[PDB]
Amino acid sequence: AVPFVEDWDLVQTLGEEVQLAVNRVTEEAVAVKIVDMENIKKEICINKMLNHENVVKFYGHRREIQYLFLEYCSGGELFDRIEPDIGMPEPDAQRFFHQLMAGVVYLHGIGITHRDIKPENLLLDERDNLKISDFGLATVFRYNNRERLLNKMCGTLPYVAPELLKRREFHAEPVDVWSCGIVLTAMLAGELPWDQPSDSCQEYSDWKEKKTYLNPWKKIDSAPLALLHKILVENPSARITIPDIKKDRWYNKPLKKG
């Protein structure tokens, strides 16, 4: 074994903590999540389940203050790529949305729901490949092929699905689909549509009344807007599922060169 190979230097804070760690010998870069301690114990267990190119990789943890060794994403947060009131070019948004769907399909396939999808939690590597990040709110919604309904209110209000605010229990998967829809809206409009999806929120009422001549909707082309009409559906049982998102016209529209 090579001496010093287990030493990592903390080179800079990534966000309050998360530190950029660089290996003393190989100079490999990883992100180290440092948390001063059960909620963290659940995060580690779920992270140990994960292995997908669009999910932040988990390398392991040191017990010691908990240390989480995570995939370093040098491109930063998707959040920062969104220009206020503008968004980003549609081809870039579609590519990010494809990779988001890939990561969410993977998590749902192993029975995990993230529960807080938003641009702050979608990170980018050196090639701007998207990675779903931070499973501190994640939980199991399917185990031994049996679905468990959720009831814990959590997430982030502008991104959260209406059923969470309205119903005692709800299916996990439609909630993640909804937040992905809000992320898509943010990417294409550079603004979030409403403070929260409540009947008291005027902007949300305007949407249910199909007033798409207003912002953010009028900034969005008809093709992606049509997908958003199928995702941001109030009734989670009527809301489009991911298999059907994969069949959507805009989702399959050639837009971006390699």
Ligand SMILES: C[C@H](OC(=O)Nc1ccc(Cl)c(Cl)c1)c1nc2ccccc2[nH]1
């Ligand atoms: C870093 C800063 O981020 C944002 O403003 N984030 C942001 C804006 C709207 C929404 Cl709805 C969301 Cl979720 C995020 C930024 N990024 C830029 C890109 C080009 C030009 C100016 C820019 N300012």
